[PDB]
Each structure stands twice: as structure tokens, then as C-alpha cells.
């Protein structure tokens, strides 16, 4: 009541745990222009303003503690942020806290995370470790959404190829398929974050906060909620998070190549430029697919060890056509 | 910002379908027929800007353009409850009122005559859209006006936003029923042509399939034309849901179609919905299971595209995304997958990555769901080629017979020849062939 | 605290078991009641809220119409040497502006407390250096509106009045230039001088008006409203005193009237002085251009009238004198334009440096002054500090 | 002393627009239609003295002069509830009631015929003003009477008050409706001429944008001229609010136009307002986002000014004054102008400091605002000349064809020649050249004939 623990948890779920998926979609749509800038040129305050405006325009406005929710632009990429979060519970926490920001120019869309202002006594429960884990999960999901947005941008540029003759669009076909593969990867990562991370972690947080018996019990429940959110957002596994980040980077490069090739095909040497762009997009798609296949292989191993039909259903959601299943097996 | 969708309404049938689509979108977003946000629409998680544009600081207007060659339909729109939904500058009525005479070429020539008004409508909707993704044209392929004007609208949407994605839900005419509109096969070809050339994803809505769904799933013995238009609007809604309902994934039309459209030519999508219910059949909340939903969506009788039962060709989906809402048991999903595999109810593309994306969203409080748990699938499926190939063959059969061309010869576009009909038939044939290829590994070389 | 509140009201307005706690709660309750009664007495007897409203209207420039009318009336007077100002005359001018503006609609108890103060008149001083609004605080309200608080309020009043006087001087210069363009349309060679005067006066008016807006609204009006709300919410006389002192200190700091903002205040004063210099130069240029235009118009009219009378329109001697006058006017017009451009550039440099200091100032009102002075980012293009302040801090707090 | 504004009402349409403007100002200041302060109007924080003068300690009388060549509108004003607001001695009605016949020259001749009464009203209002800022001319550009009489009033205000600022609210004709007044372009050209030469600040309100908004937003198939004129009057009111609603800055008309008018010749201002809402659409409280607001502001359908595409002039802002109405923080207005600069929505002079001045004012408690947040931008932008240049070119096209000139040939100003039309075209050309110069460092020399001749070569 006095520290509004349940309100703070609902605000964190809406913003930090990405439970309000429309809010995150709106924020990334608003911040995409800033995220196209180099990380050094990105103004974190602009991304924060876009986040708060999406929150106020989305159902995250219904959180009574939403005004305590702030946007945090992580100084490190999703892979480095995930590694830092994984180090938080490890003796490397001091090393990761002092770890220089990842030289990889994170997009503002990929660097975007929420922070949550917790008043006493709830600050006993929403500790700095929990806030950092929520920020890492947010940054990971935001990076996935950035990759999705880049694939969508490539798709928009390729829509004009439908007006060109098949023969004139042939060199775009490789770029269009690369863009499709990148979009499928990004969308499946987002689907994981939404239906396996965001919703389950928000429900777990609300249930644990509802079952707390004391302030130390509340702290334990909040820490468990944060750890669950970090784990399900792939932030607790540094190899999975590194593979996902590499796949998203390759997907973004593929999408940019595909967009260039589709622009040349729409303009159409231009066909040669489009075919070269398509080949580069296909190579980026191959690298992204390889990292995604390694992630899928690890997920398959986990599903096979515990006989968890749930995880097999998750895999079937991510690999409905079996494109990544053969690549993971390979 | 939401990915706004501009609705192009062509001819009497197309304008009725567009009006019902905009009504359904308003109901899902809690927008009144007058453009006012309903008090019950307290879940601010919906993207109203996807289907509506702001005309002023207070009035939200549907992004709908009403185009007809006959004044009756435009006057009916201006006399409908949706009269305030549409931008009055987005309503083009032919002064001559003569319509297209059920001639696709006449409808196209009227679209050319109303080109300025339609492109002004598209530009006004785009400027009112913070992040306009593209235009979705809702029309019928069987008439004269809705087909030709629909193709014109698709052309103008492609012209104005050439770097933006354009997804369409294009209803192709039934090719197995003898159309009283003898030029319908030409009209169907022109509509499939426009969907192939200017849309990035085309959800084929076969009025034969709509009637089949009403009979088998909605228990409607005689589906009315209004019921067919509402089925087409439901198909368009299901195909556009990822643009209209923002979530973690598929938040833009280009993002939605990217996973579905592997190549620019293989853009002919088939749709399926389950459970399908008629507006009158709301009474019985059917406990539809995930297995029942997936089976009916894969069933041609419940699919909003009428593919024949080909026993020889393994027609397949290029990609399918199912957004499922409600109570779902993992064990029921597992049993559903087992039964689907045993029955081979769905074939997937072999040539590219495809998956079911899942976004979890709260439901609209303003839209009554007849199902405790419902789901929409948007899919690119090669069985839509069977509609497009049949439409192309019928077009060629009519053009070779010069059937109903006298009504088109009244319009300048068809005064000297019917070359536009033959080009439309060829484009629809190429679209069918590319969509069929997308079920096969060789889709990488489709159109070479 | 109880006895202190009682003294303020007078001068300004279990025991067997736990003896230590048996009376503690009773003592605290009695203290609270006594302090509340003292504060209520101070409010009822000293009209603390009415004095605060008067301070807001006059010293915090809350009566914006009154401040506007005072500055407009003072512009022709405040440009004169202060040594010729009569305090009685300045008070009469203030009263006239009140009667000519919405200040006349203020209550007589409020209006009687709003006054014009003349500082010690020195030769060469302008009215901007000596004009201030004041608000007399006495009795219990003087416990909240202390001498420090009253000095801060008067400082903010004087700063806003000086800035508004300079703004209105430059606005009158520009108005004269623009209006005389119609007269000088028949003297197109002189139109450019008037336009240059208008541009320089417009820049000076923009600077002074933006500084005045920041001081009077972001600092003075907001701090006055906060003081009044705190006093209305005050539970005791000491709480009211502390809240009013904090409000006055905040107003002084954000209006640059505090001790720590003294460098910012000096830079703002130098900007205002350069704006007044630009205004005066523009007014002189426009006056010269309008006089030349009027002479040309009179010459043209006399020529037309003589032609209508069938006389030779101008004598060769008169025509040579007219041509010489027009030549001298045209040659002074480029000179007037150059002088106005030089004055504008000096003013713009001073304003840019003041805006940079303001944007780097800790006071938020000074950052708002910089943002207003560079609304089109002219000063932001010229003063790097206005560009950096908004961009730099927002990035650091997003990294934790 | 307050900066008083004299209202000049010209012709039937102009006098009706002026009357409705004065009614709106009275309502915003809590002045009854008879000019008496209502007993409930105890909030003395409004600046009535900007637009109204006090006849006695209690009665505020509008500084308005009503001039028409047709008696219908003046009689309708005297039969309206606002009949007592205007000085009856300041109302001139032509005995013939015939109007100007949609002839600009006839309107000018009527202004000349009513010169004495109008200038007597203006002088009486100025003498009652301790520090009179200037005259505001209310007229229509589409008729015959209001344009010529408005130009006459502007000329006489410039002649009589050469040291005072002259702000104008200049209504540009609707371009989407077919005007029945075929000679409207001559009237529009003469009005733009007078605003360019004799006004110190002209807020251009293009009725075409009002009609576009009425069509797209109000679902009005055929927007009437009256709705466009009322939208234009609303735009002018919003642009003048900082003069009419005193605040920390820009509390006077000369102070208001100084920040808006960079050069004496480059005095043609363009306006923009956001969010724009119709009075009727109060019903739907739209959850408008800042992103949605900013996006709608950039849409021409929501902008209350239809600026033409000038292809010749690299238009820029000469000066900007922002009149903000409602609950406005000066720091928030400043941040808004800053954001406008970041988007480069206005280019400013490079040779001196120039900005958007921001005044924070309280809103009238008595006037219901249909918009939670509103803002007016006043800017001097050379692209506003494209409307005036087009009006001048159309005027010249009609005069060269003698179209509708028979109504003008009845008046002495046009009996022998059409020199008034050519002078209007020349003044508008000089205005275009000065506005283009005001985009340049040479704006110091803007309006000099050497620059008019260098921009016309």
C-alpha cells in the first residue's frame, strides 16, 4: 500500500518486462529514426521521450506506477547487456559493472530499456540487480524489435518489385528471400519474447507479489520474477544471447542489402547491383540462420532432455515450416 | 505510430465490402460509425490509426476512399451510417452515373477518370497517417466497376507509395459458377493482375468459398450478397490483423508480409478462418478447440479461398502466422499437431523460412468475440493459385469469345481492342504460377 | 515550536508508569493546535494571502497587463536621463498606466500596495536602471515576506520592468520604421534604412522580451504561485515563513536575483543594455529615414501642386536642392543600414553570450530564456551552450 | 499604457467579419455585446484595452469604425446584440445601399466617400488611447467594398500614425470555391497591396485551407464562404491573442508585431495553428499524442493557412511571434519553437539574432476551448507572397480583359484608368522582393527599390 509494490510491479511488467507489447511496438516505431544514427550520435533522451509517449498512448498508461517507470538506454549491445546481467549474480558483476560500453554501435531501438523507480520499502524488493535484469531483458526484446523493423523496412522497399516483370525482378528474388528469412528470424525471436518471456514473466511477477508474506518475502519474489524474466528473454544464457545478437546483426545487414537490391530493381548495371546486393543479403542471411540454428539446436537439446512437450510446441512455433530444424541438425 | 491502412472502395460491391470492413475495424477499435471513440474502448492497446485517420484534432475518419462509376453506390455510402467515417474528398462519383456496365474495362476507364480524386484520397490519408505503411484495396472481382476501379486504385496506391509496402485483400470472382456478369472473368483477371503487380500480399476471397464457409461453418443455407461482403471483410480483417493490432512482432504491414512473401511474384495468398460464424449465429458460443480451428482453417470449406480438392498436387502454405487468443491447453495443441500430421492437413513451403509468430495481446473490450478462444491466421498459400489460374483461364475464354466486350467498348480504354483483358489474364496466370511455385523448393527460380 | 508560534501570534499577528511518554503526545498535540491557531491569527490579522497576491501581481509581474502598461508608458520617459525623473512623477505615471490597463480592476487594497519606486537618480542612468515594483510587507506577513524575500521580489520586478522597457522601446522603434515605410514608399531609397532599423529593433525586442518572459513567468509568476499555494497549505506560521522564504529564494535564483546568480544577472543586464542600445540606434535610424521620407513627400506634393497650378513644378535651383537632398538621403540610407547591421551584430553577439551563460546556468528559468532567445536556434547556432545542455544530460541518466 | 488597436470595418462582408471578431474578443475578455463588463467578469486579468477602449470607468467601447457601401450589413450590426459595442458615429452606411458591385475600385471610392467618418473614428479612438499602438483593418478580399475601403483605412492609419505599428488581419479568398465575385482578384490584390505597404504586420488567413478543413474534417461537401471566413477570423484571433491577452512578453500590439515583422517592407506574415478543431467536434475527446499532434500540424489539411507554392523565392522566416492561448508555460512555448527549429520548419535571417518570441498568458475562464492544448504561430515567410502575387496576377488578368470593370468604371478611381490595380500589383511585387530579401543577409536593405529591381530582373 505505502510503497505500491503491486503498482510498481505492474509498471515494470508494462515497460521493463514488455508486457504491453503495443507500447513497445509504438516506442520502437517512434525511436527507429533515432536508432538509425550511430550509437554515439543517438540521444538517449529522445528514445526515452518516445518510450514515455508510447507508454502514455498505450495501455501502459493504466499502470498507476507508470510515472515511476523510466526508459534506460543501455551502454552495451544486447549480447553485452545479457552478458553483464549474467555476470551480476557472478563474481564478474564488479567486472561487468566496470566493463566499458560495448564498442558495437547499438541502435537506440536495440539499446532501449525501461527502469522502474521503487519507493521504500519496495526498494528492498526492486533492488538494483532486479532493475538491471529487467533492463537487460528489455534491451534484448527491443533489439529483436529493431531487427524486425529493419526487416520490415526491407520488405517495404521490395514491395515495388511486384510491379516489375519476373525477368526484371529475378535478381531481387534472392534479396527478397534473404529479407524474408531475416524477418522470419526476427519475428520468431519476438514471438519468443512475447509469449514465452513477457506474458509468463509478468504473470509470475504478479503471482509472486500476490504471494509475498513479508518484505523479505517480497524481495525474494521480486528477485525470482526478475530472474525469470531475464531467463525467458534469453538474457541469462550468454551463448544464446550472443547467437541471437549475431543473428539480428546479420539479419539487419541482409535487410539493408535486400532494400538496396529492391530499390535498384525498382529503378531498373542496376540489375548487377541488385544481384550483388542480393548475394550479400543471402550471405548475411546464412550467418543469421547459422546463429539461429545454433540457438534452435540448444532449445531442442533442452526440450529433449526434460521431455517437455511445451518446449517442443515452442520450437514448432519458431520452426513451423522446419526451416531452422534442419539447420540446427546440420 | 500505427501502420495506417488506406481502404479503396470500388463500385457497388467493392464499396459495400469496404464499408463493412471499415465497420468491423471500427467495432474492433471501438470507433463509432460517426468517427467518435466509444466510451467502452478503454483498452488503449489497439491501433485505431491503422484503420482510421484523424481529419481534425477531434474527429477520427476511416481511411476509406469510395470510388464508383455509378452514382448509386456513392450516394448510398453518403446516405449510410458511415457517411461521416469517409473523407468527403475521398468519395469519387461519376457525373454520368452510368456505371461500368459490368465491364471491367469500363471500370478501369472510370478509375482513370477518377484517378485524381482517388490519388488525392490516398495522399490525404497518408498525410493524416504518422507512419503510413500502405493501402489495402477492398473490392469485388465479379462486377465491372469494382474490378476496374479497384485495379485503378491499386495502380495509384503503387504509384504514390512506391517505396512503401502495399498489402491487399483482393476478392477474386468465383470461376466455377457461371457469372451473370459475362465480363466477370476479365474483371477477375484485372483484379488478380492488380493484386499481383501492386500488392505485396493478396488474400484471395472467393465468394464461392465465402458461401461454402457460411453453409458449413456459419450454417447459412443461402448466403446473401451482404453476407458474402461481410465474409470478404472478415478475410481482409484476418489478413490485416498484424497491421491493425500492434504487438511485439509483425507491427507493420511490410513486416507482416515479409515472412509471407518469399518472392515478389509469389504474392498470391489464400486465407482461412475458424470458427466461422454468421452474424445471426452469435448465440451459441461454440467451445472451438485449437485442433478444430486449425482443421477448419486448413479445410477448403472454411477457407476464404475456394481451392479445388486436388489429390495429385500437394498445395501448400508459403508461410502462416496464427495469432491465437484465449484459453489454449498445451496438451490440446500437441494432440492437434498429432492429428494434423496424421491427416496431413497442412503442407508448408519447402523453399524458405516460415513460422507461426505469436504475439500475446489483450482483447478489445469493444469487439464481442463469439468464441471463448479465437484465432486469426494470415497465410500465403499456393492453393490460392487455383483461384487465380481459374480466373485467368476464364478471362482468356471470355476474351477469345469477345464476351460482354460491347459494354467495355463504350469506354475509351476498350474502344479499339481488349488488350487490357488479355494482359490481365496473363498477369493473373503468372501470379497463379508463382504462387504454386512457392509451395515447391524451386520457388527460388520462379518466374525465370 | 508551540511557544514560538504563540510568541509570533502575540508579537506579529501513565504519568505514574511512563512519565516521559505520558505527556509527550499531549505536548505535541497541544503544540500542533497552538501553531495552527497562531498561523490562522496571522492570516486573519495580517492578510498574508492578500499581501502575497499583491507581491505576485506587482513584484512578481503577475499583473502582466500592469507591467506591460508601465513599460510602454515608461519607454519614452525611461530613455531619458534618470536625473530628470521625479519620483512623484514616476508614481503618477505608474498610476496612469494602472488606470489605462487592467490593473485598474485590481482591488484597492492590492492596488495601493503596488507602487513605482525610483532609485537614487544619477546622471546618465535610464529608467530601466532605477525603475522597480515593490511590495510592502509588515506585521505577521513580514515573517513570511521577510526583508530578504521582499528584496528578491523587488529585484525580479525591476529586472522584468527593465527588460520590458527595452522591449517596448525597440517595439516602438520597429513600429515607427514599419509605419513610415508607407510614407517612405515614395522614397524607396530610404525604405532600406527603415527596414534595417526595424530588423535591429526586432532583434533587440526579441531578446529583451524573451528574457522578460523567462523572468516574469518561469521564475517570478511560478514562484509566486508556489508561495501562495504553500501559504494556503501552511500548517503553522513557521511553515509559512519557511515556504515563502524558499519561494523567494527560488524566484531570485531563477530570475538571477540571488547572490549565486549574480554573474548571470550581470550578463543579462549587459544583454539588456546592448538591446537598449540597439533599440535606440534603430529608433534614430528610423527617425532619420522618416524625416527624409516626409521631406521627399512634401517636395513631391509641392511639385505636383505647382504643376497643377501651371507653374514650373520646381525651379532649377529648387530642383537642384531637391536632387541634392534625395542624393544625401540615399547615401545615408546605406550608411544607416550599415550602422543598424553593426548594432544588430553587436547586440546578437551579446545576446548569444548571455543565452549561452543562461543555458549553462543552474537556474531553469535562465535555460528557458536561452531557449526563447534562440527559438529559431539563431543564438543556439551562435551560442553552443544552448545546443549542448538539452542534449548532454538526458544521455547520462539512461545508462544506469 | 496599453497598446490600443483601432478596428477598421470595411464594406458589408468586412464589417460583418469585424463585428464577429469584436464579439469574439468581447467574449474572451468578458465584455458583453453592449460593451458593459458583466458583474460575473471579476477576473480583471484580461487586456481589454488592447482591442477595446473605455468610454467611462465601467463601459468598454470597441475601437471599431464600420464602413460599408451597402446598408444591409451595417443595419444588421445595429440590429444585432452587439449594436451598442460599436460607436454609432463610427458606422458609415452608404445611403444608396448599392454596395461596390464587387468592384475593388468602387470599394476604394466608397472608402474615400466615408474617409472623414472612418478617420474621425480612428482619431477619436487613438486620442482616448494613452499609447495607441495602431489600427487593425477588418475586411474581405473577395467583395468590392470591403477591399477598397480596407486599403483606404490602412493607408490613412499609416499616414496618421507614422510612428505607430499597424497590424492587419487579412482574409485571403477561398480558392476551392467558385467565387461569384469575378472581380475578386482585383480586390484581393488591392488588399494585399495595402497590407504590404501600409500595415506593419499582416497575418494571412487563406480561406482555401479553411474550406479544405471543412471538407475533410467537418464532412461538408460544399463549404460555404461564411465558414471559411469564420475560420480565418479564428486564425487571426489566435495570431493576435498575445496582443489581446497580456502576459510576460509581447503584451502590446507594437511588442507583438515587432517580434513578427523583421523589416518594414517584409511585413507579410504567414500563420499556423495546431491542433485545429471545429467547434462542433467537441464531442469526441481524441487521445491525441504529441507525435500525432506534430504529424497533424505538418498536414496542410490541419493548417489554417493555404500558402501557395512560390517557385521563385527561397522563402524563409524573417521574424516569428508566437501567440499562445490557453494554459501555456513560457518555457514550454520556447521548447516548442526550439523543436520547430530542429525540424527547420522556419529558416531565419543569417545576419542577426531572430527567434520565435513566446508569451505565456492565462486563458479566459469564460470561453470554453474545444482543444485541450492549442497554439498559434505567426511567422513572416516569403511563401505567403505567392498568394498575394497570384491575386495580383489574376487582378492584372481581369483588368487586361476589363472583366467586371463596368462596376468599377462607375467610381472615380477607375473611371479613366486602372492605375490603382497596377499600383497594387507593383506593391505586391515589392512585397515579394522584400520578403525574399528578408530571407537574405541583405534584409537590412529590404524594400529598397534597388532590391525590387534586382529581384525583378
Numbering used by the authors:
A (entry chain M): 533 to 800, 838 to 899
B (entry chain m): 1 to 448
C (entry chain N): 241 to 253, 277 to 663
D (entry chain n): 1 to 457
Structure paper excerpt:
The complex is an asymmetric cone with 14 “spokes,” each comprising a γ-tubulin molecule supported by a GCP2/3/4/5/6 subunit. NEDD1 is a cell cycle–regulated protein that is important for γ-TuRC localization and microtubule anchoring at centrosomes and within mitotic spindles. We found that the C-terminus of NEDD1 forms a tetrameric α-helical assembly that contacts the lumen of the γ-TuRC cone and orients its microtubule-binding domain away from the complex.
In a new processing pipeline, we re-picked particles, cleaned them in RELION, and performed supervised 3D classifications and refinements in CryoSPARC. In the first interface, blades A and B of the NEDD1 pinwheel contact the underside of the γ-TuRC. The fishtail’s upper H3 pair contacts GRIP1 domains of GCP2 (position 1) and GCP3 (position 2), while the lower pair is unattached and less well-resolved. Our NEDD1-bound γ-TuRC structure identifies the latch as MZT1:GCP5-NHD, allowing GCP5 to contribute to multiple long-range γ-TuRC interfaces, similar to GCP6’s role in both the lumenal bridge and belt in stabilizing GCP2/3 subunits across the ∼30-nm–wide complex.
